[PDB]
């Protein structure tokens, strides 16, 4: 009676644990991957991250400048 009215079967807890373990394992591997990706982008600068501004080339004036040699 106690088992019937207060508790559930073992399969429920077993499969809930399986799902929880999957979630945590993927989170751990994602954390490692993100750390490595951040390190690579900060070192190489070719990624979307750690992009530091440079001078906009639309500011340059391309006209004759009173002297032939610029």
């Amino acid at each position: 009676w106690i088992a019937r009215t207060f508790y559930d079967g073992p399969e429920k807890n077993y499969e809930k644990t399986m799902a929880i373990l999957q979630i945590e394992a993927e989170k751990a591997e994602l954390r490692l991957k993100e750390l490595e990706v951040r390190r690579l982008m900060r070192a190489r600068g070719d990624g979307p991250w750690y992009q530091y501004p440079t001078i906009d080339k639309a500011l340059i004036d391309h006209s004759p400048k009173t002297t032939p040699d610029n």
Binding site: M18, A25, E29
Partner: protein
Amino acid sequence: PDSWDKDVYPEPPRRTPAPAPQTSLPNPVTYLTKIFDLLVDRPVTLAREFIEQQHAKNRYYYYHREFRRVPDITECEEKDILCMFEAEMQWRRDYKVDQEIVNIIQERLKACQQREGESYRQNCAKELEQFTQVSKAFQDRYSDLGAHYSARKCLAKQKQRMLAERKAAKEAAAA
């Protein structure tokens, strides 16, 4: 009684001597056990008959749960957590079953010692060898894993023992 298996818990045939009274003087044990039967065994049996028939009016059953076999820790990839969980649970169930096997053999040993009386040293050698074998196997499997034991630690211990055995056998063959 049918409540347990006679093979898992064996007993000898239990030979009992017959009373051979050398005198006509009345002993107290037989008369006293007769009045004990009359005063205790009979009403207790009546109450049990009533309780058993009340139980028989309402008969219902329960079942022993069956667990199938799952791949063990040796077949699990290095970080695959789902198979590791399944293997760990299976290993824990097997560990408890092994504990219960050791308990059964120890019960056999204790019963033999009590039963054989003054002849227990000679007449309980079979149970002593059974317990020696089972204890050796259990100690090989689980002795030094400690708290925070796991299937991986048990596998590592087995692998270490197997390397030692293989090295010894190769030395013996080449000696």
